[PDB]
Structures are given as structure tokens and as C-alpha cells.
Amino acid sequence: SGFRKMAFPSGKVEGCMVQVTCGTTTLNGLWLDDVVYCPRHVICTSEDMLNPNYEDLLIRKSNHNFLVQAGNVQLRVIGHSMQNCVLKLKVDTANPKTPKYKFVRIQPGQTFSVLACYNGSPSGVYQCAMRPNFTIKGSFLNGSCGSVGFNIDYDCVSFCYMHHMELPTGVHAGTDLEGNFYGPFVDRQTAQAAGTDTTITVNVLAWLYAAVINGDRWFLNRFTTTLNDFNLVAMKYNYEPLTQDHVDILGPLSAQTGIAVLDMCASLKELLQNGMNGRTILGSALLEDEFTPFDVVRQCSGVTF
Amino acid sequence: SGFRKMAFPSGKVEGCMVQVTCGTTTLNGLWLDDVVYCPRHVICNPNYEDLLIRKSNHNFLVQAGNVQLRVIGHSMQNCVLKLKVDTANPKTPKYKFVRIQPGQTFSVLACYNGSPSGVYQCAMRPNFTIKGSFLNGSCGSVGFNIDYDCVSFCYMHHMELPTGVHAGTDLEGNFYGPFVDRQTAQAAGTDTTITVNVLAWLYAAVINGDRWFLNRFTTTLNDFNLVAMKYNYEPLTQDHVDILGPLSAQTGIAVLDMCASLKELLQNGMNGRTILGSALLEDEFTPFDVVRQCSGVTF
């Protein structure tokens, strides 16, 4: 029993964090095998950030300009290349702590753990979700660039995010581990703003199923809805449209609790109309959208209370 | 910017998790140096000395990864069993066993079959329970904090109470709260809100640009405690006021001025608004957690 925002154990990722220095800029890098991955903006000055020509800035650098520190040891850079917005620094030592890993690009609504780092040293771990507007609501200070997002399914670490910048609203933007940004963002100091954000509907439904599994049914009602009528109501509350894929994905939780997806959709509609009336659901007074259907099955029991 | 419920990096603790089996019971153990610590209920009116005297070293199966450790001794200390093994854990970090007080926070590395599955942050409630997330097999999972490079172990999981909340001991086997390790009618007492932690979280909200709840008013400590007692909030002591000193100096809001904001929040509610993305007053961040997360201390 109980339902917490749970992050994956960070040990496999902590053993990959290094510090990358180029000139006066210091940020974090991910050391996997003999390559250190970091944001390419490490080669920039604050002036260069308005309209950097990364190719022009990189051609002027040599291997010895990049200082890489792993713990108290200085690694030797023997090569460098750029792939999209990530810089790949070839080093002369393979990381003996390299876990089994993959680089995966996630979709909005997916969750992941973040190991926030400063000067190549891990400071904290938290759980978060890729918002529908492609930003993340993280907790990052100056020096956190290069910190990574990941999932650990079995013994394999799937790296899905590398932190690059903070937008004016305090939200964060970054890339996958191949250097492709999530969202319409660029690694430039230019007028960029996060688009209007929406609630991840399929995740709120999964979280309502987690509440039913843990014994809470106060919010259920005798109604059902069509998918179309649910979406017409949902979009008036800035909720993402619920697709037939989402309904299919909620199938296992529907079978376990005995509540049809469109029946749970009707309880969500009523919650949006009435509010909570002083009550809570899993210790929260708001509808939670940062637990996927997969997170709920992983964390919750297989037997409904 | 941003404020998340953040746990300490769990790597130093993951390297200590092992699986302990005795008969049909499997749970988690903490392997430090040549000793494995685990709940004594792994041997299960349980007369634990009578049950332990009947066991031999080879009855305890200890598995570290894919390796079977050899148990060469066993002893009980309060509600924890200490299994002496032949091999010292080469991954043993610098550590201490510390007992925490209600209101203090810690990270939990939830484990099943000696394998870590998740990490979360939580607080020791004033009623000595923890609102954790634990399933069957989680017994022996540990709570900890990190100070520089030293892991301070403060909690070991033992049981779930009927309300879904959890109970456990420090690493010396002393329970937090009036609980016993047996299947008997036990219930968590009435809980209260950790006042000093709510105030620290209000200061974190101000640091992150959320100021709608501030007002021109102040209060006395006595008047605040009379009001706080009415809403099932823990009393605020002069020690708590002193501990909030740094945050008061940084934001320019006196502790008793922030108390007048909290009094107005309790009497009138949030009025449809949120603070740091929450519609409830959050009490699981200490004044130290707020300073650490708004400064970037590393481990």
C-alpha cells in the first residue's frame, strides 16, 4: 500500500557523471565506454549564445582545450565531434562503471528520473514527465547543464534526456542523447517561450485507477461517456485529447479494477466539474498527471483492495 | 528554478542491498563490512530468543547479486538480526547509524529480493509512521541521508499498519513509535502537520517567485501556537524560529511574519490558488532540504 512519486535507483547513472570544462564554462558530461556526451553550448561564451555558429566555434578547438574530470582523475580527450546539439568527446579510458544502456527518444506524457548534477557531482534524484509542450518542470540551478534523464527497466539504463536550458517561465528544455531537442527549442539565447501546457489525460486516468487499486472509490459515478463527448469536455479544461491508443493502453488497469475506461472517463469529467470538495485522492488535492499507465502497474499491487 | 521532492543519490546504498532467506520468508538485508542487518521477523506470540536459539548459521541464505554469502554467526540487537558473514562488502561506504526525530526527512531505497526498485523522499511523521510506498517483500528496505561522503542510515522497514502507513526501526533495532514486530491490533495515532517544514516550504515558494500569500502582518509565537493547535499543527518552538533564520534573512520575511501568512492560509484556505504546484500545504521538506535544493550541494 501507498503511492509515491518514485524515481529509479540512480547508482548506475552516478558512475557515469563527469565534469566538462572548456574555457570559463563548466558543466556535466555522461561518460559511457570511451565517449563523454555533453551539451555543445559548453564551447560558447554568453555573448556567443545569441547566434552561435557551432561548426565555426568547434573547428577552432583542439582536444586539449576540453578538460574532463572523473572524480579526482583527469581524463585525456583524444577526439571530438558534434552530433546535432550534443558534443561527443572521445577519451583514452573506457568507463569501467559503464552499465548496460540504450539511447531512447521519449514522447510527451512519458516519465523519467533525473539525476541533477553540479561540477560532475550528483546532488539529487527526482521523478518527472515530458510535458505535452515538450518542456520538463525540473529543479535545476546554474551548473546543472548536462544532467540526465533516464529509466531503468530491468538492468538496462535507457537514457532519454540531457538538460540544456531554462526557459523564462522557470521550465526546462533539453535533447535526447543523440542531440535532438524535444520541442521547438534551439540552444540559442533568443526569444523562446514554452507553448501553452495541457494536462496528460491518460496519466490522470492511470492515477485514478491507482487510487481504486489502493481502496479509494469516492469519485466513481454511475455514468459512462463516448470518447468524443469526453474529449469535447476535456479540451475545455486544457486536458490533452484521449486517443483510442490511450484507451487500449488502459486495458490492463480496466480489467484489474473492473471499471471500463470510458466509465473512468466519466468519473474524470465529474471531477473536473465539481472539484474535490475538501477530499483528496492518494494524498493529493489536485489531479496528478506525472504517473503513466506503466508506472502505476509497476508501483501498485496486482490485487485490488 | 523549480522545486521537486528530491531524494539523495542512492548508489552508495544500492551496493549494500542483499536478499535474506530463512525458511519460506524472503526479505532484504543491509550488508556493511562483514555483517548483514535485517528485520528479526525473518525467523518468524513470537519469543524471538526462543526462535533464534533453534536456528543455525546455514539456515540463513544470503544472496548478494548472483553470489551466495556464507553466514558464520548470528545475533539479535533489539528488533534487528545481525548475520555475520565471511566476506566484507567491498562496496561498503563511509557510514553511521543515526536515530532521527519526527519531522526529519530521509530517502528510501525500496527493495524486493535484494534488488533496488525505486527511491523516494519522505518524512518521519509526528505519529512516528512514514507514508511510504511498499508492497510485500519490501521488509528490510532502508532510509538514509548523505552528509558529504557519509551515509547516515536512519530507518529499516518492518511492517505496514492497517491504514496503509508504515512502521520500522533505526539500524540498532529500536522502533520509531509505539509499535511491536508482531501481528497484533496496532494502529497509528492521530497525525499532525510538521509546522516548521510547512514554513520552510513557504520560504522555498517565495525564493521561486510565489508571493501571493504574503501579507503585511505579524504574530506572536504564543498566538501562532494557539491557532496552530486548532488545525492539528505541531507547536512551533523558538528552536524552529532560530533554524528558519537563514531563510528569513534571504527572503526578507521574518519567521513570525511568515506565521501570519500561514495563519491566514489555515483560516481562509488557498482560494483556488496553488503554491509550488500544490493545493495543500506541504510538510515533507525541512529547512535544511530547502537550503540544499536552493543551493545545489553535491555528493
Ligand SMILES: CNC(=O)c1ccc2cncc(NC(=O)Cc3cccc(Cl)c3)c2c1
Ligand atoms: C544564475 N542562474 C542561472 O543563470 C540559471 C538558473 C537555472 C538554470 C537551469 N538550467 C539551466 C541553466 N542554464 C542555462 O539556461 C544556460 C543557457 C542559456 C541560453 C541557452 C542555453 Cl542552450 C543555455 C540555468 C541557469
Ligand SMILES: CNC(=O)c1ccc2cncc(NC(=O)Cc3cccc(Cl)c3)c2c1
Ligand atoms: C496482503 N498484504 C501484504 O502482504 C503486505 C502488503 C504491503 C506491505 C508493506 N510493507 C510491509 C509488509 N509486511 C508486513 O507488514 C509483514 C509483517 C506482519 C506483522 C508484523 C510484522 Cl513486524 C511484519 C507488507 C505486507
Ligand SMILES: [Cl-]
Ligand atoms: Cl515514450
